[PDB]
Design a protein around this ligand. Structure first.
Ligand SMILES: [Fe+3]
Ligand SMILES: [Fe+3]
Ligand SMILES: [Fe+3]
Ligand SMILES: [Fe+3]
Lengths: 163, 163
């Protein structure tokens, strides 16, 4: 009933993946801020804080199931992109990879019949749907602007209001 | 007006230093949590959030002065100490290193006639004093506990109420 070390390792690896996710979004913030998109940058800082809450859910769960957390090195993220679209495409392909990693913990836990870990991951399975969708929606709004800066600047102001 | 590359680089290095600070304090939480001292772990998690607000103050000042932030790789922190007083001694030593780091930027800024940066750094010089004082107050109390798991119980409960 205590977490297996194979499940404890998959959860710890995901915890460090959420930390890197946070750092990566802060890095996109540095980029948007340097390019004068203060709203996109604000959105990325809020997203970085939200990735830290994901990491700490894994953190607390590992300890509640009798495991222990080991923090690894965080690799230097990219710091520059070839435009707004290129940055949000990278966020999406990142989140699609995080989704796939969370599915892999789900399968592992379900094969081991670790019902509590399966239940825990259900929150993240569903949340990953919304994380991909919010990025996909921004990219669609950007695409639909075509080249029109007035529309792109409104998107900057819109995303800058994020709670 | 406005920042030299030397001062910008010094601030960007301090930003990355504060990020490592927070990561180190989270790593101390992982140790305390593994040893069942949920209150010491709580205090470390609060401190880690505090270091992130330090980092973001440097973040925003760099952009306010027309510079750009570059996030660097983050070293894997230690994950194990030899008791509770040992960990808080590593924390005190680390804060002493951060204080000296901040003094070096102050001297660099003053030598470069960047009095805006000199003014900006006053908050951190003042804050680094109570950062050191708070750890030393903890270290003293951990010393008056000797082995006794009992006096540590009261301390763990007190620190666990940190707001
Ligand atoms: Fe996440
Ligand atoms: Fe995410
Ligand atoms: Fe700090
Ligand atoms: Fe500090």
């Amino acid at each position: 009933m205590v977490i297996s070390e194979k499940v404890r390792k998959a959860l710890n690896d995901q915890l460090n993946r959420e930390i890197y996710s946070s750092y990566l979004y802060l890095s996109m913030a540095t980029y948007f801020d340097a390019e004068g998109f203060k709203g996109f940058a604000h959105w990325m800082k809020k997203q970085a804080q939200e990735e830290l809450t994901h990491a700490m859910k894994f953190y607390e769960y590992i300890y509640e199931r009798g495991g222990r957390v080991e923090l690894e090195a965080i690799e230097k993220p990219p710091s520059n992109w070839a435009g707004i679209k290129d940055a949000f495409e990278a966020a999406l392909k990142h989140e699609e990879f995080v989704t796939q990693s969370i599915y892999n913990i789900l399968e592992l836990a379900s094969e081991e019949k670790d019902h509590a870990t399966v239940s825990f991951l259900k929150w993240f399975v569903d949340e990953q749907v919304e994380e991909e969708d919010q990025v996909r929606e921004i990219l669609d709004l950007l695409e639909k602007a075509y080249g029109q800066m007035s529309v792109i600047f409104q998107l900057d102001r819109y995303l800058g209001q994020r709670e």
